[PDB]
Design a protein around this ligand. Sequence first.
Ligand SMILES: [Mg+2]
Ligand SMILES: [Mg+2]
Ligand SMILES: [Mg+2]
Lengths: 438, 438
Amino acid sequence: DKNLLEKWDKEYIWHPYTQMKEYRESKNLIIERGEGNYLIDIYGNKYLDAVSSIWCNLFGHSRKEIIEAIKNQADKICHSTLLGCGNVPSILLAKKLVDITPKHLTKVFYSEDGAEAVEIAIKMAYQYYVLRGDKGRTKFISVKEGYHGDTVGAMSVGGSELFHGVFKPLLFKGYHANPPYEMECLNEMISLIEKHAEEVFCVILEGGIMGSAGMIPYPDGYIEGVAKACKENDVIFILDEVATGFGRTGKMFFCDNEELKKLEKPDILCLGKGLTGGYLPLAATLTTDEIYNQFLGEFGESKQLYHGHTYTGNQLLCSAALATLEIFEKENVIENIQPKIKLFHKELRKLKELEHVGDVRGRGFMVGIELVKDKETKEPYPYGYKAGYRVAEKLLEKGIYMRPIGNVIILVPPLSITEKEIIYLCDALYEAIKEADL
Amino acid sequence: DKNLLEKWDKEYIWHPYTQMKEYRESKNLIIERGEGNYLIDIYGNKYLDAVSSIWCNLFGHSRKEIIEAIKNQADKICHSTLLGCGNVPSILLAKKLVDITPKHLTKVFYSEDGAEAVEIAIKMAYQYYVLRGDKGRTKFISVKEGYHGDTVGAMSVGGSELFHGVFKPLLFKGYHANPPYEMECLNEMISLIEKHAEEVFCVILEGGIMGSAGMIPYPDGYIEGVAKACKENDVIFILDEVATGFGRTGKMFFCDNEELKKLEKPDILCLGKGLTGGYLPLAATLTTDEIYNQFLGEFGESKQLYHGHTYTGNQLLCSAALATLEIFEKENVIENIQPKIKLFHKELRKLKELEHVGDVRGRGFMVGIELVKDKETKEPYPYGYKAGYRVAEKLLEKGIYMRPIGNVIILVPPLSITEKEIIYLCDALYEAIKEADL
Ligand SMILES: [Mg+2]
Ligand SMILES: [Mg+2]
Ligand SMILES: [Mg+2]
């Protein structure tokens, strides 16, 4: 009963990232099923998933290989532990993950969410230095507006003042450079690394684009310059590819970068979201043997990483990821998305001419369109104006689901998006921006 | 394949809570499938899952309703967002969760792991008081040896010195009473609540037993007196039932307690592990409307809880839980386990006679058996001696999988354990303790 579902949703669920007073007043999408690149609501209406269910869905909502891998695994066993035991799917997947990532990344620690992968990276980096005999390395370096998740460790190293600023008494402190967007901003970051090296246990950045800040790319050369500064100063470099990993930027991983490979950076890579093709929560933290080796010794020396929740390496999670990686290989996904990305960027250029479009930016299939009140001033709409949501409302009427962040329209379409869907998406966005009350 | 699986396991996976030096030297259980209460390894050998795959498995490894619920949901859709949208399974499950928990707990915020549920509880409690206009409530009260998970927020409020003590520079600070194990100890805790009330955003405890500390029960009346003290002193009380929820202690939830119900405590309840019957990572944080309502307002007031990772409310996770709750209701689980728990406790009594058993304690199906070098002194075995693992080795020869914590043998059997399996288990433990080098 559709009216009951709507009522129960508003009565019983406290939704993530949502002002519930407004959600309870509106007619919200309630999804019942999915086919291809489309979410289907309880009214039977179809919406193109233009943000990939928040940046995780790679191949659509009815991809048979991943669905069948889950069902086949559930007929064997859904979960048994990695605490002092092993399980088959987690072993096969760990080999695949080591093999598809840079050669210096050789060890796999599993978790469920990108934020937990980052918490684990933080704890490994911190404890590495303690075990290695370093003293006083209790701080970190990151960037303003960076985002790594919403638990306390993730929030500490993030720079998301709006989301996490209220929690400052609970966060551990470090240093934040100005948003990365050679350039004055690289120089600023190198200077911070050089100044604070001996007091810091890591530098952490996202994989070449700041997602939650509104899909802003790091300038070319930026991550490579930071990595080299980390190497020159004996600081661990953590790259968070929770959103960028698995093809979204046009490469398999941002860190598939000859210069980073040459530097053997990052020392720690976090993965999540698209790892399972979007169907289940798995994440991974991959490290160098150098980091792993510090935690080796006799049991009674108490040097092991005392971390790991219940469902670490769960077989259903790992079965979805195995199927995902198998798709990558068998369908030559990275080569096959190249004409689609090229078409997407070509189809976005006309948005630049609209009166309320300040900036069109991003990398591959991760794009933001920044709305502005005045093109020449660059002046923003007030937060309370919900300019991006005004655009989202118009897109919904044209059969497209888009979630913005503040003034930034976000497009993170599935790798499976068709050329026709791309052309439709950008033509609909053009009209939507014109129809919105801006 | 078997030798390669073993090699890849040791080569590529950094296992949770495991000294990898030692794991790489040993022959470790690699699980391939499950049937009923038994894990089946890649050699085809069967092991009774006497710890329920680390305290999550409720009904065995081949429970058709849960497996079928997962498969049926995967044919509709595996995942769409709860960020500003809804999905059907999460709605049906949220109503069921509200309905089966105490009546003052009316709202459901989903996550993947119990540690995240506790981080969310922390953040809700903290931000509640900021929004309500209170100043300086930045500390918490908990207990020494308590355990809430391994992310930074969970570690801060936990009291697990061995696991998390090295991370102290990254943890936010508070007050820890002495382990609840007795009126003297309740009075100590109440006094701390009275003393620090206006500077504290929560008191957090486990649901009636301290798991990771070695299955030590809180005395009867302890939780009730703390809850009453929280009510009388205007402090939020968070109860972590991640391990105790869904029948393990003999009741559906520890907080199904007439006194706690009358006090309308706890204010926030954390659930996880057995929620999905042990098959997938789902967790939930349930709260009162009082807490939820502080976060209501207009969008531009920015009062919403800016928390929620990608896979919040995932349909596969929620489908497993729906099936789980349905089993509870349709098979009258809580009434049916009562003679089995009584049998279990009766069959453990003989262990008390053995030379190296210091203590047999627990609640329902959560039991610890504390090993000691001298029964007269109660002196422990050194950490490095791994006395519990010595016992685990002998149990493994008898077709039983048990994971200890230091000197404590842990038994957390599935709710589906048969009377025959219970008698087998306790007789084998009796012999295993005798055979071990203690
Ligand atoms: Mg590699
Ligand atoms: Mg055209
Ligand atoms: Mg309730």
